[PDB]
C-alpha cells in the first residue's frame, strides 16, 4: 500500500451526542500519487439496515504529496431525525474510510455507545429517545482495521 495509516486518535471523547466527531489521523504516503485521496466518516444509524447510514463528512486532496501527513478530521453529529428509535440508545458503529481513485483501501470501525447519564433516564428511558440527554462514548481502545488491496498505479 502506497498510503499507510499510522495512527487514529479519537478526540473529545466521551461527549454529548450533538458534539462533532473529531479524529486526529496520521498517515504516510510512500510515493507521490497523481490522483485523489478521499476520507469519509460514516455513521451507522441502524445496525438493522444500511439504508440509515449517514455520511457525516468527507475530505478530498489530490494529487497526494509523498511524506507524513496529519490532520484532525471533524464531522457534525448525525441527524437524529434519520435514526430509528430502536437504534438510538445503545451500541452502534462509526467508520472512517479512505479511498484512492475511488477504491476503498482502508476502513477503521469503532463501536459507539450512546447512553443517558442521569439516573431517572437510565431507569425510565423515554419511549421517544431524547438526544439532548444522550452521551456518545466511542470505544476508542480497539478499532477494527480492515485493509483492501487496490490498484495504486
Amino acid at each position: 500500500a502506497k498510503v499507510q495509516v499510522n495512527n487514529v486518535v479519537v478526540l473529545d471523547n466521551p461527549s454529548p451526542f450533538y458534539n462533532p466527531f473529531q479524529f486526529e489521523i496520521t498517515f504516510e504516503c510512500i510515493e507521490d500519487l497523481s490522483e485523489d485521496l478521499e476520507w469519509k466518516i460514516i455513521y451507522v444509524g441502524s445496525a438493522e439496515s444500511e439504508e440509515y447510514d449517514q455520511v457525516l463528512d468527507s475530505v478530498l486532496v489530490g494529487p497526494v504529496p509523498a511524506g507524513r501527513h496529519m490532520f484532525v478530521f471533524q464531522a457534525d453529529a448525525p441527524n437524529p431525525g434519520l435514526i430509528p428509535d430502536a437504534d438510538a440508545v445503545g451500541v452502534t458503529v462509526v467508520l472512517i474510510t479512505c479511498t484512492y481513485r475511488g477504491q476503498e483501501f482502508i476502513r477503521v470501525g469503532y463501536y459507539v455507545n450512546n447512553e443517558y447519564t442521569e439516573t431517572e433516564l437510565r431507569e425510565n428511558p423515554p419511549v421517544k429517545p431524547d438526544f439532548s440527554k444522550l452521551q456518545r462514548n466511542i470505544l476508542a481502545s480497539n478499532p477494527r482495521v480492515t485493509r483492501f488491496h487496490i490498484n495504486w498505479e
Binding site: 451507522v44 438493522e48 439496515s49 467508520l95 469503532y110
Partner: peptide, 9 residues
C-alpha cells in the same frame, strides 16, 4: 434484526 452488531467489519 440486530444479529449484521460483525457493520464494524
Amino acid at each position: 434484526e440486530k444479529x449484521x452488531x460483525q457493520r464494524i467489519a
